[PDB]
């Protein structure tokens, strides 16, 4: 049994997408089907269900009036057309067998899912700022300094330190995705306190999609 | 209709793992079909267990005999049970229910088959720099690295009163030494930043809280 | 998409994969149809003859497939959709009151 | 108010899979077997022994 989804991608608030699921390995015309969502880092959420013959359709209230589910049993294809997309609809969409039996149900088999991204902004470069300690804990003279990379649109951002000179103690962290639609990222290095007055600390941020190369006096 | 699951649980192999799923008073656990779904990182959810009673159940394809289910009516709670745990059983687990066209999923329990001595989280909190304040904004970054099962809770504070605005925290993430890392961001303005005498990042992990503070002084 | 006095707004990838006979452009006399097999099927060949029948109207099939799409109309040769969501920002500086005197 | 249109294609696709057969005229001719017979050729004589 294989459930292969497609038809998703990057959309912007409003508008419409149409998701399609090709089914094989089983008698498609005899099973109910349902779509289920999973936002990045969040749990599962049922979207809509369609019966085997298509006579009965069900929708979650969070999608009612905006989504509509369709079936084509002769081609073994499941459809979910989504209108008036909002930021809440940003998630991975799974196609699943929603079976019906004598007193037993369930989402028997799942597809690998397709990504649907609703976002308003177009493309944006970052602004880099330092993160100085200003406090000295002096636990084996270990002081930690870094730089934050704020409000960039495309996820690829490569961060170096002292143009590759600084490799020991480097920690670049995964980014946030803010309600503004942009990403923010931070990188920190732990350094001996004996170097505060001798070693010049420099962070090297490169954001290729927008042609920004920012090196800040961390 | 609300299904409530603990965000994360943790145990060692050979243990009889117990993952609860409390049903809201809307429903009655004894009258419900229980569907548990297993999802490991990088994979789709798989039907793990159907359970109505000890006489009415069915394990998922390829799910070992060690998996079982149960119910308790007093607390309106369903349970997923794993005899003789093993590292392969480490995944996220979601309970699910049917109710008049609605397929309701629980929050999902992230089960950690214990592999490590539960590590102490290392926290550091940074204030706003100068260059960004002159751009009229002020963003405080709180960074968490090298901690035990990837589940922390961060609470932001300011002058004693908990704030719930301008906060965005990363999900936990496995890094080099198989430990987890995360980062929380607090976004304020320059006047918002000066208004309060003191801010604090308050991260709790397994019921023990680490708290770091920063001051505009 | 114009079906017969019924009109819809249709996504491209779904419209390209419609399993019905088609021809690309407009007409200039005898358009050439492709995949004519989609609406005509041969059955039960017996050694000197095979029966062939048309499938019938696919009105309900596509109308069911179009369930939930953005609807539209056409008349005057240019009339079109019923959809909104117009974000405006308007200034009334040059807007004066009439009859204040 | 409007009519939905012909549901010929809808039902024809819905009947895809069953056993069916045709008639002409006023006599329903089916195409299916399983006829369990038992026959006696006792009085079935020959033609050419001589």
UniProtKB/Swiss-Prot annotation, chain C:
Q: Give residues for the crosslink Glycyl lysine isopeptide (Lys-Gly) (interchain with G-Cter in ubiquitin).
A: 78
UniProt modification remark? N-glycosylation plays a role in virulence in mammalian and mosquito hosts, but may have no effect on neurovirulence.
Q: Where in the cell is it found?
A: Virion membrane; Host endoplasmic reticulum membrane
Which membrane topology term applies here? Multi-pass membrane protein
Q: Which domain of life is it from?
A: Viruses
Q: What is the annotated role of this protein in its UniProt record?
A: Binds to host cell surface receptors and mediates fusion between viral and cellular membranes. Efficient virus attachment to cell is, at least in part, mediated by host HAVCR1 in a cell-type specific manner. In addition, host NCAM1 can also be used as entry receptor. Interaction with host HSPA5 plays an important role in the early stages of infection as well. Envelope protein is synthesized in the endoplasmic reticulum and forms a heterodimer with protein prM.
Q: What is known of its domains?
A: The transmembrane domain contains an endoplasmic reticulum retention signal.
Describe its assembly.
Homodimer; in the endoplasmic reticulum and Golgi. Interacts with host TYRO3, AXL and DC-SIGN proteins. Interacts with non-structural protein 2A. Interacts with host HAVCR1; this interaction likely mediates virus attachment to host cell. Interacts with host NCAM1. Interacts with host HSPA5. Interacts with Aedes aegypti SRPN25, APY and venom allergen-1 salivary proteins; the interactions do not affect Zika virus replication in human endothelial cells and keratinocytes.
Protein name listed in UniProt: Envelope protein E
Q: What is the lineage of its organism?
A: Viruses, Riboviria, Orthornavirae, Kitrinoviricota, Flasuviricetes
Curated annotation (Swiss-Prot), chain D:
Q: Where in the cell is it found?
A: Virion membrane; Host endoplasmic reticulum membrane
Position(s), cross-link Glycyl lysine isopeptide (Lys-Gly) (interchain with G-Cter in ubiquitin): 27
Describe the processing and modification events after translation. Answer: N-glycosylation plays a role in virulence in mammalian and mosquito hosts, but may have no effect on neurovirulence. Ubiquitination by host TRIM7 promotes virus attachment and fusion of the virus and the host endosome membrane.
In the bilayer, the protein is annotated as: Multi-pass membrane protein
Q: Anything noted about its domains?
A: The transmembrane domain contains an endoplasmic reticulum retention signal.
Quaternary arrangement and interactors, per the entry?
A: Homodimer; in the endoplasmic reticulum and Golgi. Interacts with host TYRO3, AXL and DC-SIGN proteins. Interacts with non-structural protein 2A. Interacts with host HAVCR1; this interaction likely mediates virus attachment to host cell. Interacts with host NCAM1. Interacts with host HSPA5. Interacts with Aedes aegypti SRPN25, APY and venom allergen-1 salivary proteins; the interactions do not affect Zika virus replication in human endothelial cells and keratinocytes.
The function of this protein is: Binds to host cell surface receptors and mediates fusion between viral and cellular membranes. Efficient virus attachment to cell is, at least in part, mediated by host HAVCR1 in a cell-type specific manner. In addition, host NCAM1 can also be used as entry receptor. Interaction with host HSPA5 plays an important role in the early stages of infection as well. Envelope protein is synthesized in the endoplasmic reticulum and forms a heterodimer with protein prM.
Indicate what this protein is called per its UniProt record: Envelope protein E
What organism does the UniProt record list as the source?
Answer: Zika virus (isolate ZIKV/Human/French Polynesia/10087PF/2013)
Q: Lineage of the source organism?
A: Viruses, Riboviria, Orthornavirae, Kitrinoviricota, Flasuviricetes
Q: Which residues of the full protein are shown?
A: 545 to 594 of 3423
């Amino acid at each position: 049994v294989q459930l292969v989804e497609s038809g998703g991608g990057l959309v912007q608030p409003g508008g419409s997408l149409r998701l399609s699921c090709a089914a094989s390995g089983f008698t498609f015309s005899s099973d109910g089907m349902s779509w289920v969502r999973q936002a990045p880092g969040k749990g599962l959420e049922w979207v809509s269900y369609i019966s085997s013959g298509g006579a009965t359709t069900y929708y979650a209230d969070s999608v009612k009036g905006r989504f509509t589910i369709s079936r084509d049993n002769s081609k073994n294809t499941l459809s979910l057309q989504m209108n008036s997309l909002r930021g809440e609809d940003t998630a991975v969409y799974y196609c699943a067998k929603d079976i019906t039996a004598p007193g037993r149900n369930g989402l028997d088999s799942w597809g690998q899912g397709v990504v649907v991204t609703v976002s308003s902004a177009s493309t944006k470069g970052p602004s880099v700022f330092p993160l100085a300690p200003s406090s000295r804990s002096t636990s084996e003279s270990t002081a930690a300094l870094g730089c934050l990379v704020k409000d960039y649109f495309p996820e690829p951002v490569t961060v170096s330190w002292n143009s590759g000179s600084l490799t020991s103690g480097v920690h670049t962290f995964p980014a946030v995705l803010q309600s503004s639609g942009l990403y923010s990222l931070s990188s920190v290095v732990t350094v001996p306190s004996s170097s505060l007055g001798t070693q010049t600390y420099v962070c090297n941020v490169n954001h290729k999609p927008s042609n920004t190369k920012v090196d800040k006096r961390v | 209709s609300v299904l409530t699951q603990p965000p994360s649980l943790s145990a060692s192999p050979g243990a009889s793992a117990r993952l609860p799923c409390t049903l809201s008073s809307d429903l009655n656990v004894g009258t419900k079909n229980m569907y548990w779904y297993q999802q490991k990182p990088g994979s789709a959810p798989r039907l793990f267990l159907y359970y109505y009673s000890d006489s009415d159940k069915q394990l998922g394809p390829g799910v070992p005999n060690r998996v079982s289910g149960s119910k308790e009516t007093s607390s309106n709670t369903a349970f997923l049970l794993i005899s003789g745990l093993q590292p392969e059983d480490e995944a996220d687990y979601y309970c699910q229910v049917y109710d008049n066209s609605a397929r309701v999923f629980g929050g999902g329990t992230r089960l950690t088959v214990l592999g490590q001595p539960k590590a102490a989280p290392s926290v550091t909190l940074f204030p706003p720099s100068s260059e960004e304040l002159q751009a009229n904004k002020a963003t405080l970054v709180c960074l968490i690295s090298d901690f035990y099962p990837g589940a922390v809770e961060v609470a932001w504070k300011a002058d004693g009163s908990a704030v719930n605005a301008g906060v965005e925290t990363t999900k936990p993430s496995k890094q080099s030494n198989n430990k987890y890392a995360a980062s929380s961001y607090l976004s304020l303005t320059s006047d918002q930043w000066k208004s309060h005498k003191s801010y604090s990042c308050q991260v709790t992990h397994e019921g023990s809280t680490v708290e770091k503070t920063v001051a505009p002084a | 998409l114009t079906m017969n006095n019924k009109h819809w707004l249709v996504h491209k990838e779904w419209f390209h994969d419609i399993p019905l006979p088609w021809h690309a452009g407009a007409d200039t006399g005898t358009p050439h149809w492709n995949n004519k097999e989609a609406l005509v099927e041969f059955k039960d060949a017996h050694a000197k003859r095979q029966t062939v029948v048309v499938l019938g109207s696919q009105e309900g099939a596509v109308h069911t497939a179009l369930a939930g799409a953005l609807e539209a109309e056409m008349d005057g040769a240019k009339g079109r959709l019923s959809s909104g969501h117009l974000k405006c920002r308007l200034k009334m500086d040059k807007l004066r009151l009439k009859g204040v005197s």
